[model samples]
Target: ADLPGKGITVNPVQSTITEETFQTLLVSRALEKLGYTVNKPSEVDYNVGYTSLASGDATFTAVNWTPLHDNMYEAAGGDKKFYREGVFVNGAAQGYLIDKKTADQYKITNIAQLKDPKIAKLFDTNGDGKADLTGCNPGWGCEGAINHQLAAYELTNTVTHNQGNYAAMMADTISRYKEGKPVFYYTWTPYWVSNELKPGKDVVWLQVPFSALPGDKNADTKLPNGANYGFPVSTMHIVANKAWAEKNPAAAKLFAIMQLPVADINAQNAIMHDGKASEGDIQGHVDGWIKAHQQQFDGWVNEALAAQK
Candidate 1:
């Protein structure tokens, strides 16, 4: 009586590479188990995927970030066109950081402190007389904002942005860090890098010149009218078309109930980094994780079944 999906076609969004890709697969598989004819998720940018859900081109996306994707939320008619659920991770933080010892030795707290030629030189990985930053890769949302901050800090001449493979750049940064060498690069939360570096002990967040949100999602958003360097910790969730939610109450109930710890994701990410987990490996890990939390995982299914008419 409650084969809720009944082979209904459902499209999901793979919002970001690797991490979100893994998340999409897990959610899609869960839907499949619930009897959905879940399609392989489509990889798309924030705006495109959100549009897909709203226009009924796609069913849902578990990778929506809050305040960060507030624009997308509104674009999808601001809860009227779509629904949000599965607040799995929250307040994911990001920003600049250097070796913790370096921060301590230089008494550095903000990105502005790098402007002093002496201070900037400390991060010069290439000995090119400028701080070398492993900035965001081209097209990553952070890339543009980081570039904005570089100019905003007036360190254009003092800092050089390394603009290629983020993983490779971070690998080198981490290598230097392990050897007790200086590391200056951009990083974000619930990432393997955070686990590898262990903020506060291995590294510290560098204060921005001021708190600012720099993505299109932040286009209409603003922070407090003061200076701070902390990156906004955004709420992350899954969003579905309103029609889909109303029609598929069982699926909607599961989406509303499901949540995962950010640290758990980071730890799994670290495992991937260590073993270089492929797509298949990540999928297997996702399944194993469900078993690890089998009781709660089953309860979600039970809730879904109970919610069905």
Candidate 2:
């Protein structure tokens, strides 16, 4: 017997989504199956996920969001510096979201409309008379974009980005919804926030003015629902320490080829959003995903086994 990942360590960040928990489960399990001693990944924050790998405080994280992570990426070390691999999910949707109840009740559509002050007041919490939004952590690239949008939209004084723990913030936001209170926050697709919020039903994407987005300024200009709102459709990747990957070629190969269907992740997160995210439920969901693609899944495992032999 051999221990391929006997010394391997990872971060399993909290809450419902592929970026943190699910992805961690997928890879960590494979490594465990390959004779690696995998530790349970704590609810690692976005900042910690990147920083830990850099400092070797962590071995790998399948939660990197590019372009949206460009700010944090460069700050941490950039592409080669972080040593990323695999496009786990190419279309990780990011944007401003408002409860459909409010969006519809007040006829709110574009994020620009919030500049009107009167409409912004409806989302005001903490009694500051400014719309408060749950936003990205300090070292995350999305945080930069939100800050940029706040100033660019001229809503810095009209809106507030509640820069707090996203998991906790979302918990509170989701709870408020249960209480029939209005909610506004930054969220991405294939995640529980949207699943629980039930986009197009309970919440709707808030459109950003066409200027800020870099890919194609006018791409979302006249689009209807399915579009970016001062945000981009980021590609999720796995970041591993260069030392770790080189020392574990088999794991590296798996990371390079592994991919998961975005829809499956959403279905799984839906269970989490429903307040039934027990460990067993998550494991069952992962097993279902593995079974759906077990042939390919076995190929990965066989490759790892072959690598060791």
Candidate 3:
């Protein structure tokens, strides 16, 4: 019997977000099958998680947001200190959106138009004459990009970046949309909010006037189909400590080949949003996911075992 991870403990690290916990737990449970004693994950923001991996204080995290979190990745000693491979989740995206009704009636298509006080006032809930963007949480990579784009698009005066517990803000956004009020906010793909709000029907993604990301001014935000939503489609990867990965071929192989569909992630998040998102509930989701993808799961495990030899 193969037990490459026998007598080892895997210390996983992840962000505070529960949506990402599914990915981390899935990976940790896989390592457990290889006989690794999985430790309770350390909940930290991206910066601390990356640095911990570099310093060998933690084993790995399955939520590395590429290109978007590239600065933190580089700052944490880059390739020399971390092992990153495989598109764990594909087609991750971020952008501003407005209720489709408002988009169609007002002919609002781009975020740049919000620079006009009248246009921005449409989504202004606080009566301060500024569009309240239900934006990203602090310390998350998206916040940095949102902040940069806000200034770069010169929307500082006409727009306010509302930052806090994203779940609460997005709840209000959804409620406003339900009541047929003008709704505007920042959101990303592979998330339940998109599942609920829906980009094409209930809401519509707003295009950016140009490309400007934090760190990369000349970044190309165009998708393969030639649509620029102001953010380059990013991939999430399993990033582990460099030395630990090299020492464990089985785990490294697993991380390299494992893949999850964006749709699956969105589906899982939908269940979470529907209540029953406890740790036990997420583990149940993983079990069901593995059951549905049993053959593929076995293939990954077999490949990882083969790499051990």
Best by lDDT: 3
Q: On residues 93-114, what C-alpha lDDT tens digit does candidate 2 reach at each position?
A: 7788888888888898888888
Candidate 1 runs further than 4 Å off: 72-80, 126-129, 151-154, 178-180, 215-228
Listed in order, each prediction's TM-score against the native is 0.84, 0.81, 0.96
- List the pairs of residues colliding in candidate 1: 208-229
1-309 per-residue lDDT for model 3 (tens digits):
749888988999999888887788888878888779999899998899999999999999999997788999998899999998888988888888999998999899889888889889999999989999999899989899899989999999999999999989899889988999998888887788988888788989998887888887578887677667888778999999999999999999999999989889888999999997998999999988888999998888888888944
Clashes of 2: 5
Task: Output candidate 2 Cα RMSD.
Answer: 4.0
List per-prediction Cα lDDT, in the order shown. Answer: 0.78, 0.73, 0.89
TM-score of 1: 0.84
Worst 10 contiguous positions by lDDT, candidate 2: 213-222
User: Which one is best on TM-score?
Assistant: 3
Candidate with more favorable, higher lDDT: 1 or 3? 3
**Model 1 Cα lDDT, one tens digit per residue, 76-161:** 58788998776867667777888889898889988888889899999998888899999876656576667767886688989998
Candidate numbers, best TM-score first, in rank order: 3, 1, 2
